[PDB]
């Protein structure tokens with residue numbers, strides 16, 4: 001089997017992407033944030049504290065003939081941005097882009113933090129990291145990909161995120177029409193539960209490539225590219241008037257600037273992030289200070305190849321017995 005679903009930016013900045021997901025019988029369609037940096041499929045629901053719901057579509061298990069309470073199971077998760085959610089668990093039928101899993105754990109939120117409530121466009125998360133990170137207790141649950149894997153034509157999924165445009169998540173096949181040149185595959189460590197890999201270096205604009213190992217994670221649920229402070233300083237030094245602002249919480253730059261590209265290495269291959277991808281717009285409405293899309297990972301304890309990086313590539317998440325990542329230009 002295969003599946004193929006379109007993923008759509010939630011706003012004009014590509015702050016996140018949402019993908020429609022069918023849950024239950026008859027189908028309830030929720031727009032979920034597919035997150036290769038976490039491993040829980042959780043949804044706003046009929047159980048979510050009413051004051052914490054503001055415009056999201058909810059899953060109502062009582063209206064699904066295939067829903068069943070997973071008795072005694074609870075979940076609670078905290079993300080890198082400080083947000084959190086928790087609740088209880090149902091199993092139900094879940095379909096993505098025509099690919100169906102029966103008996104998928106659907107984590108129903110009883111509580112969500114303010115940033116979830118405030119984002120009316122995201123109805124929950126669908127985690128695509130390794131199932132070792134799933135938070136369900138006392139019986140850890142599998143991700144949608146892990147449950148689908150054995151049925152897929154190939155044990156893979158791909159992320160093809162758009163810049164200011166829709167893109168695609170495919171399950172079970174490589175769309176050889178969706179990228180240019182060849183796919184370069186690179187090793188993955190699953191030891192922290194992430195799609196963790198090592199980039200071979202970077203370049204800023206038309207500058208020379210710096211060969212250096214940068215360990216980090218491929219994380220579709222993170223908006224920005226978080227790299228070591230040395231790398232980030234070298235990038236922003238090429239932008240007149242850019243500076244790190246402790247008050248704003250990262251590098252800012254004049255909205256009048258033209259940003260340089262940023263290149264990262266995948267083995268001997270190179271992915272180029274156009275400068276425009278690094279512009280996250282005014283820090284507050286009407287400001288002439290703009291927020292940068294490349295930020296320091298210092299204090300986060302890991303480098304994160306978030307959407308700024310991934311949307312410059314066609315990315316293969318290869319879930320074979322020994323997982324690997326693949327990157328192609330597009």
Ligand code: NA
Pocket residue numbers: 291
């Ligand atoms: Na922000």
